[PDB]
Curated annotation (Swiss-Prot), chains A, B:
The modification Phosphoserine is found at residue 29. Gene3D superfamilies: 2.60.120.200. Lectin that binds beta-galactoside and a wide array of complex carbohydrates. Plays a role in regulating apoptosis, cell proliferation and cell differentiation. Inhibits CD45 protein phosphatase activity and therefore the dephosphorylation of Lyn kinase. Strong inducer of T-cell apoptosis. Plays a negative role in Th17 cell differentiation via activation of the receptor CD69. Homodimer. Binds LGALS3BP. Interacts with CD2, CD3, CD4, CD6, CD7, CD43, ALCAM and CD45. Interacts with laminin (via poly-N-acetyllactosamine). Interacts with SUSD2. Interacts with cargo receptor TMED10; the interaction mediates the translocation from the cytoplasm into the ERGIC (endoplasmic reticulum-Golgi intermediate compartment) and thereby secretion. Interacts with CD69. It comes from Homo sapiens (Human). Expressed in placenta, maternal decidua and fetal membranes. Within placenta, expressed in trophoblasts, stromal cells, villous endothelium, syncytiotrophoblast apical membrane and villous stroma. Within fetal membranes, expressed in amnion, chorioamniotic mesenchyma and chorion (at protein level). Expressed in cardiac, smooth, and skeletal muscle, neurons, thymus, kidney and hematopoietic cells. The gene is LGALS1. It comes from the Eukaryota. Signal peptide: none annotated. It is found in: Secreted, Extracellular space, Extracellular matrix; Cytoplasm; Secreted. This is Galectin-1. The modification N6-acetyllysine is found at residues 12, 28, 107, 127. Keywords: Acetylation, Apoptosis, Cytoplasm, Extracellular matrix, Lectin, Phosphoprotein, Secreted. PROSITE patterns: GALECTIN (PS51304). The modification N-acetylalanine is found at residue 1.
Length: 134, 134
């Protein structure tokens, strides 16, 4: 990926990942990917400030064998350009749980039926400051 | 080895990398590698409890183009199996500065003179719990 890439994570069901970073000042959006590898993603977390027709909307999706799944969009957008963003993601067998900066939480189905998350990657618009595992 | 592996870290001169991890309860030693890739390590940080003929000794080395350099041993050992340990690493063109769990810090020559440190890898005896950039 463009930003920080972490592998061999072996994040098991019930375990979580907390990521804090800085969103590019001139970023139309940023990405945090979680999955098995670059082509198999359980969660493509993509807050869009202004991209692909989306204005301030969180878009989430899966990627199987390189093929994008069906997108999911949220009703809140607790992110501000050129600022710090902290998200926590919990992996579980049925669903991944995402907790946002405003306290809002949502779930995304574990479509790939992964037994663990071994891959994480941020793009060029999200500069990671810290990553923690509980 | 089998621990967490990170790439595209983009650690720049003067920037601090804080790594906190769990030292395996049965560990005879553990490793934290930092550099460009598996064949080019600015720092092979290897605390040894009882391994390779050494006892409770911190051994550091570099690896350039695959070749191991001259090992450096520290005069203190603030580590123990089955416990959490945090180390901080910073660097300039001349040396890398490594700060240990108790506040003790030493310098290791920057033998590879990399523009930035982009790779990190822990072995099976050091379970990384957190990585932070300052
Ligand atoms: O699904 C994530 C994926 O979206 C791509 O953009 C989509 C867009 O979201 C959708 O509204 C449109 O119909 O198709 C586009 C092409 O897939 C992004 O380009 C890609 O980066 C991902 O973010």
């Amino acid at each position: 990926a463009s930003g920080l890439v972490a592998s061999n994570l072996n994040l098991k069901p019930g375990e979580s990942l907390r990521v804090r970073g800085e969103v590019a000042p001139d970023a139309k959006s940023f990405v945090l990917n979680l999955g098995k590898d670059s082509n198999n993603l359980s969660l493509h977390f993509n807050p869009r400030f202004n991209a692909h027709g989306d204005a301030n909307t969180i878009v989430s999706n899966s990627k199987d064998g390189g093929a994008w799944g069906t997108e999911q969009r949220e009703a809140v957008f607790p992110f501000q350009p050129g600022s710090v963003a902290e998200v926590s993601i919990t992996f579980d067998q049925a669903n991944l749980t995402v907790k946002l900066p405003d306290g809002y939480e949502f779930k995304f189905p574990n479509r790939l039926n992964l037994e663990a998350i071994n891959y994480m990657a941020a793009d060029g618009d999200f500069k990671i400051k810290s990553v923690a595992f509980d």
